[PDB]
Amino acid sequence: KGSVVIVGRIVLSGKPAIIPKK
Amino acid sequence: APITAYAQQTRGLLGCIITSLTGRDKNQVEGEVQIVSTATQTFLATCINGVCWTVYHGAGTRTIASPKGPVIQMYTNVDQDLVGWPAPQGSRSLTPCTCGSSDLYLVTRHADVIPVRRRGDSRGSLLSPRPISYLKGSSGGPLLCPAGHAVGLFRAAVCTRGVAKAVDFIPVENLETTMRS
Ligand SMILES: *[C@](O)(C(=O)NCC=C)[C@@H]1CCCCCCCCC[C@H](NC(=O)N[C@H](CN2C(=O)CC(C)(C)CC2=O)C(C)(C)C)C(=O)N2C[C@H]3[C@@H]([C@H]2C(=O)N1)C3(C)C
């Protein structure tokens, strides 16, 4: 029985932001 | 502020498999809901009050991979259909609802938050139905009250003809209960 592995994440704590330029 | 969310995939098929056997996850953890995966399926695990809960019919009695190797579950409950491990170092936890709101929101595996009108202790009506393929992988995800606090965890979809009209969930109360048992 293998272990459950975290393959991603969902983040709710993000608040609107102005996508920066690179 | 309104409930908004995003998703970030931290690893792929092969790394996942290796990590499944190896039991050691060295990646960094962020978020309130982890996109969890086994060898058979993928779903969600929500961090509510220091513990990372997920749906039993997905995690079974498996261990979660951590940097310090496999982590044994701290709660298992075949009947409540729940399991829980200590929230991974890095995650942020949600807190249970304390407003008994009946207007809930479901954060899906695709980081989409959809409305569900509470119709009982474990049911809610999708104000705008979706096909089940969409809801796949969302088990163990959170059901937030308008304030963003945990009301429940998505368990099953109430569907017909391949379209989900409603949803069955695990009330935060069963977690607390499962904790004391
Ligand atoms: C999570 O565990 C996952 O996301 N799994 C990862 C990939 C699948 C799932 C989320 C549901 C995904 C959309 C639905 C996919 C089909 C599964 C249908 C099951 N629905 C169900 O049990 N509904 C009940 C009422 N009901 C039936 O009893 C039977 C049927 C087929 C006529 C339709 C129907 O509406 C409830 C009264 C319980 C609501 C379902 O969602 N599951 C069956 C099984 C697992 C979940 C599931 O796969 N959840 C259990 C333990 C409930």
Ligand SMILES: [Zn+2]
């Ligand atoms: Zn609330």
